[PDB]
């Protein structure tokens, strides 16, 4: 709407902004993240990991 | 004749139960905030 500056999701987090100069609406996607798992044969066999 | 080779009943069971996470479709909000 003409007066809305940003938007939110169902969990009250920010997901969009209004550019202060161009008034373009921009979605905010979080930067990629995730867990890291290390797969190892065990240090008593080999030191190669994935 | 159907992909996944599930029975008509299994197909119905998957069609009745749906996932509705507060996120968006991802191929692998989408990852919430530190929650995977
Ligand atoms: C002020 O905001 C206006 C937009 O409301 C800016 O004007 C635009 O500038 C871009 C280039 O950066 C042009 O391509 C657009 O056509 C312009 N639109 C209009 C309506 O003028 C303006 O540059 C901003 N800054 C100043 C100092 O006016
Ligand atoms: C990974 O990105 C490529 C980009 O072309 C896309 O074609 C592919 O389907 C993507 N796969 C997954 C699992 O996201």
Curated annotation (Swiss-Prot), chain B:
Site (Cleavage) residue list? 6-7
Q: What is the lineage of its organism?
A: Viruses, Riboviria, Orthornavirae, Pisuviricota, Pisoniviricetes
Look up the domain of life of the source. Viruses
Gene from which this protein is expressed: S
Q: Any idea what job this protein has?
A: Subunit of the fusion protein that is processed upon entry into the host cell. Mediates fusion of the virion and cellular membranes by functioning as a class I viral fusion protein. Contains a viral fusion peptide that is unmasked after S2 cleavage. This cleavage can occur at the cell membrane by host TMPRSS2 or during endocytosis by host CSTL. In either case, this triggers an extensive and irreversible conformational change that leads to fusion of the viral envelope with the cellular cytoplasmic membrane, releasing viral genomic RNA into the host cell cytoplasm.
The UniProt annotation puts the region (Fusion peptide 1) at 7-28
Q: What is this protein called?
A: Spike protein S2'
């Amino acid at each position: 709407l003409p007066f809305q500056q940003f938007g939110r999701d169902i969990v009250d987090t920010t997901d969009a902004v209004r550019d202060p100069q161009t008034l373009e609406i921009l979605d905010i996607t979080p930067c990629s993240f995730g867990g890291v798992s290390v797969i190892t044969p065990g240090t008593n066999t080999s030191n190669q990991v994935a | 004749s159907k992909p996944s080779k599930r029975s008509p009943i299994e197909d119905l069971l998957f069609n009745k139960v749906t996932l509705a996470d507060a996120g968006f479709i991802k191929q692998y909000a989408q990852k919430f905030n530190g929650l995977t």
